[PDB]
Amino acid sequence: MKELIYIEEPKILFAHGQKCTDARDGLALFGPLNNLYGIKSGVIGTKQGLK
Amino acid sequence: MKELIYIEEPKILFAHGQKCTDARDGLALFGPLNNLYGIKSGVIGTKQGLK
């Protein structure tokens, strides 16, 4: 019979220095580190793809 | 005794279908034709240049 150790879960730092563990919850709670003013999309494809 | 003819000043088209003759007045009255979200400025040079 051998033994197992435990390694503590790491943290990922979100906006205004808010530590968390899950990326989705940290984003839904605080938000990304830097702010883009917006995203301009260039879509190339058929008409159905554009729709 | 020679004669001079006259030609009407052309109009430039601004936001929401509004025309004018001066670019500055048209911009200050109706704004640009298109809509960006922001301008991400990259600066290259000295520290005092950044200041």
mmCIF file of C-alpha atoms in Angstrom:
data_model
loop_
_atom_site.group_PDB
_atom_site.id
_atom_site.type_symbol
_atom_site.label_atom_id
_atom_site.label_comp_id
_atom_site.label_asym_id
_atom_site.label_seq_id
_atom_site.Cartn_x
_atom_site.Cartn_y
_atom_site.Cartn_z
ATOM 1 C CA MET A 1 0.000 0.000 0.000
ATOM 2 C CA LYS A 2 1.495 3.287 -1.204
ATOM 3 C CA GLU A 3 0.530 6.884 -0.435
ATOM 4 C CA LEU A 4 -0.792 9.786 -2.504
ATOM 5 C CA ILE A 5 -0.075 13.466 -1.984
ATOM 6 C CA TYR A 6 -2.340 16.389 -2.876
ATOM 7 C CA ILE A 7 -1.355 19.485 -4.854
ATOM 8 C CA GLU A 8 -3.469 22.579 -4.251
ATOM 9 C CA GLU A 9 -5.426 23.973 -7.182
ATOM 10 C CA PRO A 10 -3.757 26.994 -8.829
ATOM 11 C CA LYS A 11 -5.343 30.420 -9.162
ATOM 12 C CA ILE A 12 -5.838 32.580 -12.256
ATOM 13 C CA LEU A 13 -5.848 36.342 -11.721
ATOM 14 C CA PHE A 14 -8.731 38.335 -13.221
ATOM 15 C CA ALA A 15 -9.481 42.063 -13.426
ATOM 16 C CA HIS A 16 -8.498 44.359 -10.525
ATOM 17 C CA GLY A 17 -6.479 41.576 -8.931
ATOM 18 C CA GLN A 18 -9.325 39.154 -8.179
ATOM 19 C CA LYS A 19 -8.072 35.599 -7.742
ATOM 20 C CA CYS A 20 -10.279 32.685 -8.768
ATOM 21 C CA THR A 21 -10.057 29.061 -9.890
ATOM 22 C CA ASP A 22 -12.553 28.648 -12.749
ATOM 23 C CA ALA A 23 -11.943 30.869 -15.770
ATOM 24 C CA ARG A 24 -15.622 31.047 -16.737
ATOM 25 C CA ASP A 25 -16.761 32.130 -13.276
ATOM 26 C CA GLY A 26 -13.912 34.618 -12.961
ATOM 27 C CA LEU A 27 -14.880 36.171 -16.292
ATOM 28 C CA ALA A 28 -18.602 36.232 -15.483
ATOM 29 C CA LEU A 29 -17.794 37.803 -12.096
ATOM 30 C CA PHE A 30 -14.992 40.292 -12.833
ATOM 31 C CA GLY A 31 -14.065 40.429 -16.517
ATOM 32 C CA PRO A 32 -10.905 40.311 -18.624
ATOM 33 C CA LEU A 33 -7.716 42.113 -17.666
ATOM 34 C CA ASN A 34 -7.625 44.609 -20.547
ATOM 35 C CA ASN A 35 -10.498 46.250 -22.403
ATOM 36 C CA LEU A 36 -10.946 46.213 -26.149
ATOM 37 C CA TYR A 37 -13.231 48.995 -27.298
ATOM 38 C CA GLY A 38 -14.835 46.581 -29.749
ATOM 39 C CA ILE A 39 -14.236 43.871 -32.315
ATOM 40 C CA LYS A 40 -14.518 44.510 -36.061
ATOM 41 C CA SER A 41 -15.223 41.279 -37.928
ATOM 42 C CA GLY A 42 -14.288 40.475 -41.503
ATOM 43 C CA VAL A 43 -16.408 37.556 -42.692
ATOM 44 C CA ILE A 44 -15.518 35.745 -45.920
ATOM 45 C CA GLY A 45 -17.814 33.050 -47.259
ATOM 46 C CA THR A 46 -20.972 32.298 -49.173
ATOM 47 C CA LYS A 47 -24.210 34.205 -48.629
ATOM 48 C CA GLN A 48 -25.503 31.411 -46.395
ATOM 49 C CA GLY A 49 -22.304 31.653 -44.363
ATOM 50 C CA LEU A 50 -22.775 35.393 -43.939
ATOM 51 C CA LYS A 51 -26.356 34.865 -42.761
ATOM 52 C CA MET B 1 -15.090 92.754 -71.574
ATOM 53 C CA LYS B 2 -15.170 89.003 -70.937
ATOM 54 C CA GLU B 3 -17.779 87.034 -69.016
ATOM 55 C CA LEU B 4 -17.569 84.688 -66.029
ATOM 56 C CA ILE B 5 -19.856 81.714 -65.457
ATOM 57 C CA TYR B 6 -20.599 80.218 -62.048
ATOM 58 C CA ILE B 7 -20.801 76.618 -60.838
ATOM 59 C CA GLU B 8 -22.549 75.556 -57.640
ATOM 60 C CA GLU B 9 -20.493 74.327 -54.707
ATOM 61 C CA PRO B 10 -20.721 70.535 -54.257
ATOM 62 C CA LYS B 11 -22.083 68.928 -51.107
ATOM 63 C CA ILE B 12 -20.445 66.233 -48.974
ATOM 64 C CA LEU B 13 -22.617 63.599 -47.305
ATOM 65 C CA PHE B 14 -22.348 63.061 -43.537
ATOM 66 C CA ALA B 15 -24.027 60.709 -41.050
ATOM 67 C CA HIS B 16 -27.754 59.923 -41.402
ATOM 68 C CA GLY B 17 -28.156 61.398 -44.859
ATOM 69 C CA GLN B 18 -27.118 64.930 -43.909
ATOM 70 C CA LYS B 19 -25.247 67.047 -46.450
ATOM 71 C CA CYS B 20 -23.197 70.211 -45.991
ATOM 72 C CA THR B 21 -20.359 72.118 -47.651
ATOM 73 C CA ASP B 22 -17.731 72.434 -44.893
ATOM 74 C CA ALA B 23 -16.134 69.265 -43.540
ATOM 75 C CA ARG B 24 -15.615 70.698 -40.049
ATOM 76 C CA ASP B 25 -19.170 72.024 -39.738
ATOM 77 C CA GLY B 26 -20.654 68.791 -41.063
ATOM 78 C CA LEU B 27 -18.608 66.686 -38.650
ATOM 79 C CA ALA B 28 -19.471 68.927 -35.693
ATOM 80 C CA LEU B 29 -23.166 68.856 -36.637
ATOM 81 C CA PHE B 30 -23.759 65.219 -37.645
ATOM 82 C CA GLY B 31 -20.571 63.190 -37.146
ATOM 83 C CA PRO B 32 -18.703 60.692 -39.307
ATOM 84 C CA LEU B 33 -20.365 58.416 -41.826
ATOM 85 C CA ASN B 34 -19.121 55.229 -40.135
ATOM 86 C CA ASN B 35 -18.895 54.187 -36.488
ATOM 87 C CA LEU B 36 -15.742 52.850 -34.884
ATOM 88 C CA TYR B 37 -15.593 51.823 -31.230
ATOM 89 C CA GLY B 38 -12.172 53.180 -30.311
ATOM 90 C CA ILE B 39 -8.631 53.766 -31.494
ATOM 91 C CA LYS B 40 -5.830 51.665 -30.004
ATOM 92 C CA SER B 41 -2.776 53.918 -30.185
ATOM 93 C CA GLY B 42 0.647 52.347 -30.571
ATOM 94 C CA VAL B 43 3.456 54.784 -29.805
ATOM 95 C CA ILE B 44 7.123 54.278 -30.697
ATOM 96 C CA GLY B 45 9.816 56.584 -29.388
ATOM 97 C CA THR B 46 11.379 58.150 -26.322
ATOM 98 C CA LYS B 47 9.846 58.553 -22.875
ATOM 99 C CA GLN B 48 9.408 62.312 -23.272
ATOM 100 C CA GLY B 49 7.769 61.599 -26.623
ATOM 101 C CA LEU B 50 5.299 59.359 -24.808
ATOM 102 C CA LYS B 51 4.649 62.131 -22.285
#
